[PDB]
Amino acid sequence: NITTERAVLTLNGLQIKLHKVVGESRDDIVAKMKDLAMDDHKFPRLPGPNPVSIERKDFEKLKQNKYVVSEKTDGIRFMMFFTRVFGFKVCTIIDRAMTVYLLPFKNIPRVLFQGSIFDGELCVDIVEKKFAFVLFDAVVVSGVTVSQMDLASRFFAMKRSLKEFKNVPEDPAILRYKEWIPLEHPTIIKDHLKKANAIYHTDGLIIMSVDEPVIYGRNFNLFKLKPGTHHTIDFIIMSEDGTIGIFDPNLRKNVPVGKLDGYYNKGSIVECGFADGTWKYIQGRSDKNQANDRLTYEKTLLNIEENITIDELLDLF
Numbered sequence: 065n066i067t068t069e070r071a072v073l074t075l076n077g078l079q080i081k082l083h084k085v086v087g088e089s090r091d092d093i094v095a096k097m098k099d100l101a102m103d104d105h106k107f108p109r110l111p112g113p114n115p116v117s118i119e120r121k122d123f124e125k126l127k128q129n130k131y132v133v134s135e136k137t138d139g140i141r142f143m144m145f146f147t148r149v150f151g152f153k154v155c156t157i158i159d160r161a162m163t164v165y166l167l168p169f170k171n172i173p174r175v176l177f178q179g180s181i182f183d184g185e186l187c188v189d190i191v192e193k194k195f196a197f198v199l200f201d202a203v204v205v206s207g208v209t210v211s212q213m214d215l216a217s218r219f220f221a222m223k224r225s226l227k228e229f230k231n232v233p234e235d236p237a238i239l240r241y242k243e244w245i246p247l248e249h250p251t252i253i254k255d256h257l258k259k260a261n262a263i264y265h266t267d268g269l270i271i272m273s274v275d276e277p278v279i280y281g282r283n284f285n286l287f288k289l290k291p292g293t294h295h296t297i298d299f300i301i302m303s304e305d306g307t308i309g310i311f312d313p314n315l316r317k318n319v320p321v322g323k324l325d326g327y328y329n330k331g332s333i334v335e336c337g338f339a340d341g342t343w344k345y346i347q348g349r350s351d352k353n354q355a356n357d358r359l360t361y362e363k364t365l366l367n368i369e370e371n372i373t374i375d376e377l378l379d380l381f
């Protein structure tokens with residue numbers, strides 16, 4: 065049987081109960097996805113790109129090359145994988161740490177189960193108070209590797225397969241497709257962004273190449289933009305006098321970086337924002353035992369400093 069263990073995900077004040085796939089079953093689903101995705105990376109990862117923050121150096125490239133734009137949905141990143149395990153046709157969603165849950169739909173066409181890997185976000189529909197799964201892109205559809213073709217071909221393949229699918233009320237998520245708008249369409253972009261934000265929780269926008277094949281991992285040509293300067297960092301309290309530190313993952317030692325005004329419990333993790341030269345407390349995190357690493361900190365400072373805004377960005381066009 066597929067050895068499962070139950071789990072509940074909470075997003076935006078709502079929860080979803082799912083069977084987390086465990087042990088050798090988890091191991092086999094992951095190894096199956098690695099083969100279908102033909103990823104020979106020596107480390108377990110999803111066959112999908114992680115965006116990079118937009119930098120002012122990128123503005124040239126944005127204006128030479130072709131790109132599409134969409135809202136950055138705020139929810140959980142999942143690769144959705146249709147396969148067959150021990151004879152049964154299975155729909156799974158895998159997250160970035162390689163944790164596998166079943167997410168079953170009634171009406172998935174049996175072709176998908178020959179090997180579909182679609183990329184998306186599990187998220188909540190504000191208007192409907194139901195979960196939605198929003199598909200960003202496809203890697204393999206019914207056994208056909210679509211990853212090296214251009215974005216419009218990938219969506220053509222994906223939409224083709226699901227063309228006869230209908231959701232039914234008992235399905236655990238509303239399957240929906242990311243509408244990507246061309247980066248030369250500012251008024252169409254703004255309007256799409258306004259409609260998008262009526263339905264979803266968004267964290268800015270994502271800008272993606274119209275024609276490059278799928279990258280797996282950090283994709284230096286997939287850009288995200290946070291609205292305004294609302295970057296935060298999680299620091300560890302290294303002193304009761306609020307000395308905040310940041311983790312160096314290869315020393316495995318926290319390094320002192322600043323100091324907060326107030327009394328703080330050593331070893332806690334505080335989410336802070338930067339304002340006028342110092343970091344300021346926003347909330348303590350009881351759910352974390354580790355600060356953000358140096359890399360995340362260095363890059364967030366650069367972004368704070370550069371202060372790119374969505375209106376600056378959409379006015380380049």
Ligand SMILES: Nc1nc2c(ncn2[C@@H]2O[C@H](COP(=O)(O)OP(=O)(O)OP(=O)(O)O)[C@@H](O)[C@H]2O)c(=O)[nH]1
Binds near residue numbers: 140141286
């Ligand atoms: N690749 C991609 N990611 C998207 C898209 N829409 C929303 N996202 C989400 O944006 C994430 C970007 O990574 P980060 O900028 O680190 O954001 P995060 O994973 O929410 O982490 P925090 O910033 O710590 O909250 C992706 O991993 C997706 O979960 C999209 O169209 N493509």
